């Protein structure tokens, strides 16, 4: 087994972007590697200070693969803070509604197997980016397998519907990290950079 399959499904979820420096908090259209790695660090029972010490680079070195079963909806909420006490603070928090994601991490077999075993029973709680988004489908619902390419690993998993009817999207959105390939091979025209590389638990590249 080279990759383990994880599911991020619920009524709501959140994958914050780099555009969060004030009361207005925003998200992205796909999960980031930093949130997944934080979820894993919670899963194996490591604190915020121990993760930075020779624990995160092993997870970061693994390849990135995520599949989006269906698109989501961003929703703005009028969260208020500090009413009736002392520190009325106001803020706005955005949520992704009716979305689901499949998590794939390819690399060493031992690390993937250990991650799946810890995902069978996380030491601490597991959620969807924020404490106010519990998972709907089991994260370990889909057991690991042996594959060569990330595309085959992501497309091997089928798509599950909810009832007999309902329209389906004709595009299945999938996201992968850019393989360097041979030495050199500068990034192409359609290359995207996310500020989501965990270095500490905040520091991103």
């Amino acid at each position: 087994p080279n990759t383990l399959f994880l599911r991020l499904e619920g009524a709501l979820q959140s994958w914050g972007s780099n555009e969060a420096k004030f009361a207005l908090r925003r998200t992205a259209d796909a999960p980031t590697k930093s949130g997944v790695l934080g979820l894993l660090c919670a899963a194996m029972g490591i604190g915020r200070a121990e993760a930075a010490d020779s624990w995160l680079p092993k997870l970061a070195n693994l390849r990135m693969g995520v599949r989006i079963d269906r698109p989501g909806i961003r929703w703005w909420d009028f969260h208020t803070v500090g009413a009736g006490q002392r520190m009325t603070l106001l803020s706005r928090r955005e949520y992704l509604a009716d979305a689901s994601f499949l998590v794939a991490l390819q690399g060493e077999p031992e690390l993937v197997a250990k991650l799946s075993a810890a995902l069978a029973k996380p030491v601490w709680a597991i959620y969807l980016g924020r404490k106010s988004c519990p998972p709907s489908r089991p994260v370990c619902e889909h057991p690991p397998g042996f594959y060569n390419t990330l595309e085959e690993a992501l497309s091997a998993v089928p798509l599950q519907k909810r009832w007999h009817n309902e329209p389906l999207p004709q595009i299945l959105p999938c996201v992968m990290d850019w393989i360097p390939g041979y030495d050199g091979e500068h990034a192409p025209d359609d290359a995207e950079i996310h500020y989501d590389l965990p270095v500490s638990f905040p520091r991103h590249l």
Partner: protein
């Protein structure tokens, strides 16, 4: 361990939470519109109440400023289509028309407490953790959000409390993926419990093996709207009393009483 608590309720014409523009807040799920309640209301409705106040107690449950609290809550949603309405009022003089908006919908509540986290946060104390468990159960069951009470006295009690001990934290939002309508032979609440019970009826046949099964204690008001409206044994015990439910939970896990 994981102690999952689930809740299905119906509410009268009211406005339990409105946005900045004066409208009852909404969301999107199951392909339709759903009335909503925030989690930051339901929390702090459970908290800072005169009922919940029963090694600093309850701070392990609800942290403040690396406390690592052991109380996790989900988000409210609707179990059918939303219907907004507008109220037209005038003011007398005893010596101009505005608009106020309201809606009626069915909502959900969820609680989960990590017992090991609670005990460790108490410096090894477990009896205090058990007492805190009982206090939280009683307070959450006997409290409601503080909305527009003086005009819309919406104080319906919860119509279902389900307790589980799954190995993984999972919510049952995938029961109402379809809107729940009304027929001549049923109402909202009776349909609400059945389809949530349909979720428990499924899965268990085609999922986690019986070698490590999951038990639970069920609570319903005087065995009405029964969890598992048949002879099925999906629930180990059905309980019609809050104190008896707390005692049952205390007996199973730590071993204790009240």
């Amino acid at each position: 361990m994981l102690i999952e608590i689930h809740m299905i309720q119906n509410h009268s014409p009211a406005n339990l939470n409105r946005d900045d523009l004066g409208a009852p807040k909404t969301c999107y799920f199951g392909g339709v519109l759903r009335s909503r309640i925030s989690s930051q209301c339901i929390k702090r409705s459970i908290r800072t109440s005169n009922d919940f106040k029963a090694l600093a107690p309850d701070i392990a449950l609800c942290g403040r400023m690396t406390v690592e609290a052991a109380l996790q809550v989900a988000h409210a949603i609707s179990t059918h289509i939303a219907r907004p309405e507008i109220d037209y009022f005038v003011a007398a003089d005893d010596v101009h028309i505005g608009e106020s908006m309201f809606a009626s919908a069915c909502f959900y509540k969820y609680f989960s407490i990590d017992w090991e986290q609670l005990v460790k946060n108490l410096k090894g104390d477990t009896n205090l953790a058990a007492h805190t468990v009982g206090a939280f159960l009683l307070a959450a069951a006997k409290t409601n959000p503080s909305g527009k009470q003086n005009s819309f006295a919406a104080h319906n009690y919860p119509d279902g409390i389900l307790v589980e001990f799954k190995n993984s934290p999972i919510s049952y939002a995938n029961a109402f993926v379809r809107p729940v309508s009304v027929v001549k032979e049923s109402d909202l609440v009776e349909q609400s419990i059945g389809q949530l019970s349909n979720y428990v009826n499924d899965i268990r046949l085609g999922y986690y093996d019986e070698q490590s099964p999951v038990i639970g204690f069920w609570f319903s008001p005087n065995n009405r709207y029964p969890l598992g409206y048949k002879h099925s044994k999906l629930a180990s015990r059905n309980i019609g009393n809050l104190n008896e439910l707390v005692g049952a939970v205390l007996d199973y896990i730590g071993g204790f009483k009240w």
